[PDB]
């Protein structure tokens, strides 16, 4: 008997799930285990209520191709055990010892989301073409419906905006290598934009041809398709040379092959298929063998190619490639089982809302294609049921700098695709708040549709056509009744929204203390907050995108010093390049409490500071949202040796400072901050301009931002209480405070101008 190797998990691998440390969130559970030493191993999985795994009480899933699995049926409520072994295909038996036994509970509260097995999915997949978006029955019904009314699903708008332009256009010439195979940003981008247009032309002409019964459009589509099929698979548009170009060529070939299938001669089909298979194999070998996302599921670049590239290519190829059958199974099973380690059960996305936009964009495409083709609906999984609200609470219309993480749009209004993604989730859930969000994001942002960051990535007219055909339209509902508080526990984000519909009263507050640390597109921003109030960005996410790996990115935006957060002993949270340490440099939401007039959120960022400073023993931050009007921030820090405390807050313009306060006024709103209590000593307050130690060429011609720094003398214990009062410039506000520090606790009494009161009581 072979001895099964059961490797230790790492910071960037899958874990062994389900278990008592990781109870299932769905029924049936999503199973994963680290693979044996032999990468060409097959597995057998056993599930039983009997931890002895007696034959009659046990479910057995034999001959599994991969180290992850979702069963095709929900389990009865109860207590279960599971193990796995290596499986010998020929003799039909386990050829290794059984793994560690792990346990889990199934209750009725768990959403029931089974994955139809390989046989059922293969049987559900029709043999005819087309397959992508519409089957032949649907295509027929849609053609009849467009014959009776050219405005059916907005077809007339789609034809005009997304088909018509390609009728005049000469077939895109094959992209050329760079001067001396040395990549330049302009040429790299133009190249993948060129390949994106090849998707649009081939796909939209073919669709128009089939919908309108027009052979001439089919002929025009075919012309682009054969030209692209003739491009050098080892040339400039290969995955190896420019993967962005390579990805797009595969998608173009897939839509053309699928929708022109019957229009192409058998020989033309052979030409296209051969090149489609060859290019698809390049992508599949990268996702499966190199990126190895079934072991390393955080690789979003590889997950994107699985979703956006593999899905359409493999669907187009079904029945005419055994390889493609296997790659489609992997794709479907991966999205059903392992997608995604960035996703929280409450709908949060650990990388932040900008990366939610791009990530969801390509997940949505895969899910829509798969639902149509085999009738399996990924959106039924609870993450997708919940995730529409993440951008609703972190990227509300009008907010520019009021969230966290890498954001290529930082400083601008929320991107169009955020609304479009959320509309998809409106369709799924029937939620009218999601529709409202779509309407308002679109209104604020349209006119940027043809800009390279949208046009080079998705045709929104096609998104519309597909959405209107596939989903019932949801009526927008005012966010006036939207819950003020949304907690995303798994990722450690807490958000408050007030008066979202009102441009003069709208508040967006977000607090972050994440178990994900500074990993990947997250920063050293645990126990940090951002604040948009009275319709303006006040306490901001600072700096500019510039580029990944710029000084602005690495030395400002990743670092705690750019955040509305504390520094201890002159040091921030670990935010360098070591991925394991980045993940270790973590926070967590300790508690959230809510009653009328008082929201209390507690964050613990101890590990986050400890990684870079072993002197640190405890780092807690409380944020109080008081009487729907102002904030009280409580910073509690313990160290083994005297360390000073710095309290930072960032703004678009220069703050003015005082003896125990600072103030910033923007265009229509403003806020003041006051240090009402500091056990470690009276804070010294400074206003700082710009981005220290950052190359000014990186932000040339752009306005500098500012921050206030309040420094408390070195102490082993800090308790700092900061009152933050936002206001409309039309009605500036003042909050009064009294400290009662006698007793076993420090009591702070707050009152407004109408003697409305709040009492903070902090045990000593």
Which parts of this chain interact with Cl ion (CB under 5 A)? 344, 346, 348, 488, 490-491
* Rounded CA separation 212/210 (Å): 6
Q: What is the dihedral of CA 409, 410, 413, 414, to 10 degrees?
A: 60
Task: Tell me the C-alpha distance between 414 and 397, whole Å.
Answer: 7
Minimal distance, residue 357 CB to Cl ion, in Å: 17
CB 552 within 8 A of CB 698: yes
Residue 353 Cβ vs Cl ion, minimum distance, rounded to whole Å:
12
Element (H, E) at 386: helix 382-386
Given the complex with Cl ion, which of 392 and 491 has the nearer CB atom?
491
- The SS3 call for residue 90 is coil
User: What is the Cα gyration radius of the chain?
Assistant: 28
- How far apart are alpha carbons 534 and 729 in whole angstroms? 9
Burial of 234 (0-12, 13-18, 19+ CB in 10 A): exposed
Cβ proximity to Cl ion, 379 vs 630, nearer residue: 379
Shortest spacing between CB 127 and Cl ion, in angstroms? 41
CA 79 remoteness from chain centre = 33
- For the chain, the straight-line distance linking the first and the last C-alpha, in angstroms and rounded, comes to 62
Q: Which residue's CB is nearer to Cl ion, number 243 or number 490?
A: 490
The 3-state DSSP class for residue 291 equals: coil
Those residues whose C-beta lies under 8 Å from the C-beta of residue 463, and which sit 6 or more positions away, are: 420
Sheet holding 493-498, edge to edge: 485-488, 493-498, 507-512, 528-533, 536-539
3-state secondary structure 510-571: EEECCCCCCCCCCCCCCCEEEEEECCEEEECCCCCCCCCCCHHHHHHHCCHHHCCCEEECCE
- DSSP-derived 3-state class of residue 392: helix
Closest of 199, 205, 192, 212 to residue 166, by C-alpha: 205
Name the residue nearer to Cl ion (CB basis): 111 or 642: 111
Of residues 211 and 360, the one with the C-beta less far from Cl ion: 360
Nearer to Cl ion, 344 or 398 (CB): 344
- Hey, which residues does 721 pair with through a beta bridge? 634, 677
For residue 374, which phi and psi values (nearest 5 degrees)? -120, 0
Encoded tokens for 624: 């109080």
The nearer residue to Cl ion, 406 or 490, going by C-beta atoms, is 490
Least distance to Cl ion, CB of residue 348, Å: 3
For Cl ion, which is the closer residue by CB, 344 or 683? Answer: 344
Nearest distance, CB of residue 356 and Cl ion, angstroms: 11
Angle of helix 460-470 relative to helix 353-374, nearest 10 degrees, comes to 50
Which string of DSSP letters, residue by residue, matches 177-245?
--GGG---HHHHHHHHHHHHHHHHHHHHHHHHHHHHT-HHHHHHHHHHHHHHHTS-TTSTTSTTT-HHH
Q: What is the DSSP string of 322-343?
A: HHHHHHHHHHHHHHHHT--TTB
For Cl ion, the closer of residues 390 and 647 by Cβ is: 390
**Listed residue (77, 4, 14) closest to 36, CA to CA:** 4
Query: Given the structure tokens 């993967």, which residue do they identify?
Result: 243
Lookup result for tokens 């043809």: 450
- β partners of residue 315: none
Q: Which residues contact 635 (CB under 8 A, 6 or more apart)?
A: 566, 620, 621, 645, 647, 718, 719, 720, 721, 722
Pick the closer one to Cl ion by CB: 23 or 665: 23
Q: What distance in Å separates the CA atoms of residue 475 and residue 431, rounded to the nearest whole number?
A: 9
Q: Which of 625, 741, 729, 615 is nearest to 676 (CA)?
A: 741
455: enclosing H helix or E strand: helix 452-455
Nearest residue to Cl ion, using CB?
Answer: 344
Which is nearer to Cl ion, 5 or 594 (by Cβ)? 594
Q: How far is the CB of 387 from Cl ion (least distance, A)?
A: 9
Of 45, 83, 48, nearest to 64 by C-alpha is 45
* 339 versus 664: smaller Cβ distance to Cl ion: 339
Least distance from C-beta 350 to Cl ion, angstroms? 8
Toward Cl ion, which CB reaches closer, 488 or 672?
A: 488
Would you say 348 or 419 has its CB closer to Cl ion? 348
User: Looking at beta carbons only, is 327 or 393 nearer to Cl ion?
Assistant: 393
The span from the CA of 390 to the CA of 566, in Å, is 26
Find where tokens 């693979």 sit.
35
Cβ 714 to Cl ion, closest distance in Å?
37
Smallest gap from residue 560 Cβ to Cl ion (A): 23
Pick 87 or 383: Cβ nearer Cl ion = 383
State which residue, 349 or 699, has the beta carbon closest to Cl ion: 349
Residues forming beta bridges with residue 473, ordered by sequence position: none
| Sign (positive or negative) of CA dihedral 309, 310, 311, 313 | positive
CB of 418 to Cl ion, least distance (A): 18
């Amino acid at each position: 008997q072979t001895l099964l190797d059961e490797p230790r998990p790492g910071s960037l691998t899958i874990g062994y799930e389900p278990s008592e440390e990781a109870q299932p969130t769905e029924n049936p559970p999503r199973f994963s285990w680290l693979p044996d030493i032999d990468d060409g191993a097959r597995y057998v999985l056993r599930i039983s209520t009997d931890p002895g795994f007696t034959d009659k009480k046990t479910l057995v899933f034999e001959d599994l191709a991969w180290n992850f699995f979702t069963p095709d049926e929900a389990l009865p409520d109860g207590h279960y055990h599971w193990c796995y072994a290596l499986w010998d295909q020929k003799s039909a038996t386990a050829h290794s010892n059984w793994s560690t036994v792990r346990s889990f509970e199934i209750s009725e509260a768990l959403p029931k989301t089974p994955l139809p097995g390989r046989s059922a999915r293969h049987a559900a997949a029709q043999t005819s073409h087309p397959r992508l978006w519409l089957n032949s029955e649907q295509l027929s019904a849609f053609a009849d419906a467009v014959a009776k009314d050219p405005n059916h699903c907005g077809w007339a708008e789609f034809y005009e905006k997304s088909v018509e332009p390609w009728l005049e256009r000469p077939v895109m010439p094959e992209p050329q290598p760079y001067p001396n195979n040395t990549r330049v940003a302009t040429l790299w981008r133009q190249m993948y934009i060129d390949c994106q247009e090849v998707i649009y032309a081939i796909r939209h002409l073919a669709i128009a041809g089939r919908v309108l019964g027009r052979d001439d459009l089919l002929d025009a589509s075919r012309k682009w398709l054969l030209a692209v099929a003739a491009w050098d698979t080892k040339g400039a548009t290969s995955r190896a040379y420019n993967d962005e170009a390579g990805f797009r060529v595969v998608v173009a070939l897939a839509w053309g092959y699928d929708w022109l299938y019957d229009h192409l001669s058998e020989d033309e089909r052979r030409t296209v298929r051969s090149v489609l298979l060859e290019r698809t194999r390049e992508v599949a070998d990268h996702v499966i063998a190199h990126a190895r996302i079934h072991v390393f599921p955080y690789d979003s670049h590889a997950v994107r190619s699985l979703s956006a590239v593999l899905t359409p290519a493999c669907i187009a190829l079904q029945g005419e490639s055994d390889e493609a059958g296997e790659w489609l199974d992997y794709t479907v099973e991966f999205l059903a089982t392992l997608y995604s380690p960035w996703a929280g059960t409450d709908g949060g996305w650990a990388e932040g809302p900008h990366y939610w936009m791009t990530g969801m964009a390509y997940l949505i495409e895969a899910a829509n294609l798969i639902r149509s083709y085999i009738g399996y609906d990924l959106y039924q999984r609870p993450f997708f049921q919940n995730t529409g609200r993440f951008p609703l609470y972190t990227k509300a219309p009008g907010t520019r700098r009021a969230n966290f993480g890498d954001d290529s749009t930082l400083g601008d209004l929320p991107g169009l695709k955020l609304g479009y993604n959320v509309r998809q989730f409106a369709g799924v859930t029937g939620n009218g708040h999601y529709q409202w969000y779509f309407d308002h994001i679109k209104a604020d942002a349209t006119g940027t549709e043809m800009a390279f960051y949208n046009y080079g990535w998705w045709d929104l007219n096609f998104d519309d056509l597909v959405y209107r055909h596939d989903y019932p339209q949801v009526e927008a509902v005012s966010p006036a009744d939207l819950p003020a508080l949304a907690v995303f526990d798994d990722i450690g984000w807490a958000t408050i929204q007030k008066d979202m519909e009102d441009p003069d009263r709208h508040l967006q507050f977000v607090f972050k203390s994440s178990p994900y640390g500074s990993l990947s597109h997250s920063h050293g921003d645990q126990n940090a907050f951002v604040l948009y109030a009275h319709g303006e960005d006040l306490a901001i996410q600072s700096g500019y995108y510039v580029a990944f790996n710029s000084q602005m990115h690495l030395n400002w935006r990743r670092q705690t010093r750019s955040k509305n957060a504390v520094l201890i002993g002159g040091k921030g949270q670990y935010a360098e390049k070591d991925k394991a340490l980045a993940r270790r440099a973590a926070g967590r939401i300790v508690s959230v409490e809510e009653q009328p007039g008082h929201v209390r959120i507690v964050g613990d960022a101890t590990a986050a500071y400890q990684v870079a400073n072993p002197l640190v023993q405890k780092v807690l931050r409380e944020t109080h949202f008081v009487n729907d009007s102002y904030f009280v921030i409580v910073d509690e820090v313990e160290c083994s040796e005297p360390q000073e405390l710095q309290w930072l807050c960032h703004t678009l313009g220069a703050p003015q400072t005082g003896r125990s306060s600072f103030r910033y006024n923007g265009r229509k709103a403003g806020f003041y901050g006051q240090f009402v209590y500091s056990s470690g000593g009276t804070p010294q307050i400074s206003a700082v301009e710009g981005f220290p130690d950052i190359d000014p060429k990186e932000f040339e011609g752009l306005d500098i931002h500012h921050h206030v720094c309040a420094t408390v003398p070195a102490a082993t214990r800090h308790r700092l209480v900061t009152l933050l009062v936002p206001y409309s410039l039309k009605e500036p506000k003042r909050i009064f405070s009294f400290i009662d520090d006698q007793g076993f606790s420090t009591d702070i009494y707050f009152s407004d101008v109408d003697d409305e009161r709040f009492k903070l009581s902090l045990p000593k």
